[PDB]
């Protein structure tokens, strides 16, 4: 049903395509750095701290996620 | 108004330039020693002036540390050195002096 | 008057040769840690 509809409504993006402008993503350099927006008029401070992760495809995203689960998450409304 | 009163003003502009806080982007009132009357005057400043004051002090301490000075164009011009603390500090001393006149009788 | 003469000139060379290795090295250690402040950039963004 779905494949029929895709030929029914999405066909008409061929004829001739790409060729002249092939746009592949270049890698993005991670920098160990700090951004500090001091604002004492805001009631509570927000901090986000991160190292460079490996990316979508890497098999060891599973193992990192397990450790991230061990640390987990908290919230003042949690019963625990 | 006078030729010699323009000379006192030019000697004052000389000293101002020799003092060289303007080289660090500071205004004159930024550089004042913090006593009790002064602390209160800072306390009494509006939000916009306090925030600017904080940044100017921040900038100059940063320059002081890296032993640098601002580009010549960015120096505080003697003519436009806004004496923002003046009326606040004058009012605090006015109030102190009254208390002291009262504490005398 | 100075029996130690020869020995002090010897350790004195060792003092100079060590300091010549240590002075730039401790300098580079201090310069490394301080580069966080030396290259720090300020921006002031007051409301409207």
Swiss-Prot record, chain A:
Complete-protein stretch covered: 241 to 320 of 480
Subcellular location: Mitochondrion inner membrane
Superkingdom of origin: Eukaryota
Family: Belongs to the peptidase M16 family. UQCRC1/QCR1 subfamily.
Protein function: Component of the ubiquinol-cytochrome c oxidoreductase, a multisubunit transmembrane complex that is part of the mitochondrial electron transport chain which drives oxidative phosphorylation.
Quaternary structure annotation from Swiss-Prot or TrEMBL: Component of the ubiquinol-cytochrome c oxidoreductase (cytochrome b-c1 complex, complex III, CIII), a multisubunit enzyme composed of 11 subunits. The complex is composed of 3 respiratory subunits cytochrome b, cytochrome c1 and Rieske protein UQCRFS1, 2 core protein subunits UQCRC1/QCR1 and UQCRC2/QCR2, and 6 low-molecular weight protein subunits UQCRH/QCR6, UQCRB/QCR7, UQCRQ/QCR8, UQCR10/QCR9, UQCR11/QCR10 and subunit 9, the cleavage product of Rieske protein UQCRFS1.
Name recorded for this polypeptide: Cytochrome b-c1 complex subunit 1, mitochondrial
Organism classification: Eukaryota, Metazoa, Chordata, Craniata, Vertebrata
Residues bearing the modification N6-acetyllysine: 8
Swiss-Prot record, chain B:
Subcellular location: Mitochondrion inner membrane
First-listed, main subcellular location of the protein, grouped into a coarse class: mitochondrion
PTM annotation (N6-acetyllysine): residues: 13, 72, 77, 82, 90
GO cellular component, one term: respiratory chain complex III
GO biological process: mitochondrial electron transport, ubiquinol to cytochrome c
Pfam families associated with the record: UCR_14kD
Alphabetical UniProt keywords: Acetylation, Electron transport, Membrane, Mitochondrion, Mitochondrion inner membrane, Respiratory chain, Transport
InterPro entries: QCR7, QCR7_sf
Highest taxon in the source lineage: Eukaryota
N6-succinyllysine found at: 72, 82
Topology in membrane: Peripheral membrane protein
Signal peptide extent: none
Function summary: Component of the ubiquinol-cytochrome c oxidoreductase, a multisubunit transmembrane complex that is part of the mitochondrial electron transport chain which drives oxidative phosphorylation.
Assembly description: Component of the ubiquinol-cytochrome c oxidoreductase (cytochrome b-c1 complex, complex III, CIII), a multisubunit enzyme composed of 11 subunits. The complex is composed of 3 respiratory subunits cytochrome b, cytochrome c1 and Rieske protein UQCRFS1, 2 core protein subunits UQCRC1/QCR1 and UQCRC2/QCR2, and 6 low-molecular weight protein subunits UQCRH/QCR6, UQCRB/QCR7, UQCRQ/QCR8, UQCR10/QCR9, UQCR11/QCR10 and subunit 9, the cleavage product of Rieske protein UQCRFS1.
Similarity-based family: Belongs to the UQCRB/QCR7 family.
Protein name: Cytochrome b-c1 complex subunit 7
Organism: Bos taurus
Lineage: Eukaryota, Metazoa, Chordata, Craniata, Vertebrata
Chain's gene name: UQCRB
UniProtKB/Swiss-Prot annotation, chain C:
Regions of this protein lying in the Mitochondrial matrix compartment: 39-48
Top-level taxon: Eukaryota
Transmembrane regions listed in the UniProt entry: 5-38
Annotated compartments: Mitochondrion inner membrane
Subunit (UniProt): Component of the ubiquinol-cytochrome c oxidoreductase (cytochrome b-c1 complex, complex III, CIII), a multisubunit enzyme composed of 11 subunits. The complex is composed of 3 respiratory subunits cytochrome b, cytochrome c1 and Rieske protein UQCRFS1, 2 core protein subunits UQCRC1/QCR1 and UQCRC2/QCR2, and 6 low-molecular weight protein subunits UQCRH/QCR6, UQCRB/QCR7, UQCRQ/QCR8, UQCR10/QCR9, UQCR11/QCR10 and subunit 9, the cleavage product of Rieske protein UQCRFS1.
Family: Belongs to the cytochrome c family.
Protein role: Component of the ubiquinol-cytochrome c oxidoreductase, a multisubunit transmembrane complex that is part of the mitochondrial electron transport chain which drives oxidative phosphorylation.
Protein's name in the database: Cytochrome c1, heme protein, mitochondrial
Annotated gene: CYC1
């Amino acid at each position: 049903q779905l494949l029929d509809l895709a030929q029914k409504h999405f066909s008409g993006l061929s004829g001739t395509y790409d060729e002249d402008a092939v746009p592949t993503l270049s890698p993005c350099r991670f920098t160990g750095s700090q951004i500090c927006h001091r604002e004492d008029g805001l009631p509570l401070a927000h901090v986000a701290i991160a190292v460079e992760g490996p990316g979508w495809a890497h098999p060891d995203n599973v193992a990192l996620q397990v450790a991230n689960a061990i640390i987990g998450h908290y919230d003042c409304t949690y019963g625990g | 108004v006078s030729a010699s009163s323009r000379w006192l003003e030019g000697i004052r502009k000389w000293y101002y330039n020799a003092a060289g806080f303007n080289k660090l982007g500071l205004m004159r009132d930024d550089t004042i020693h913090e006593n009790d009357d002064v602390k209160e005057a800072i306390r009494r400043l509006p939000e916009n002036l306090y925030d600017d004051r904080v940044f100017r002090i921040k900038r100059a301490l940063d320059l002081s540390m890296r032993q640098q000075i601002l580009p010549k164009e960015q120096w505080t011009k003697y003519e436009e050195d806004k004496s923002y603390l003046e009326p606040y500090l004058k009012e605090v001393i006015r109030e102190r002096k009254e208390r002291e006149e009262w504490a005398k009788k | 008057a100075e029996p130690e003469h020869d020995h002090r000139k010897r350790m004195g060379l060792k003092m100079l040769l060590m300091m010549g290795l240590l002075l730039p090295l401790v300098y580079a250690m201090k310069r490394h840690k301080w580069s966080v402040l030396k290259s720090r950039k300020l921006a002031y963004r007051p409301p409207k």
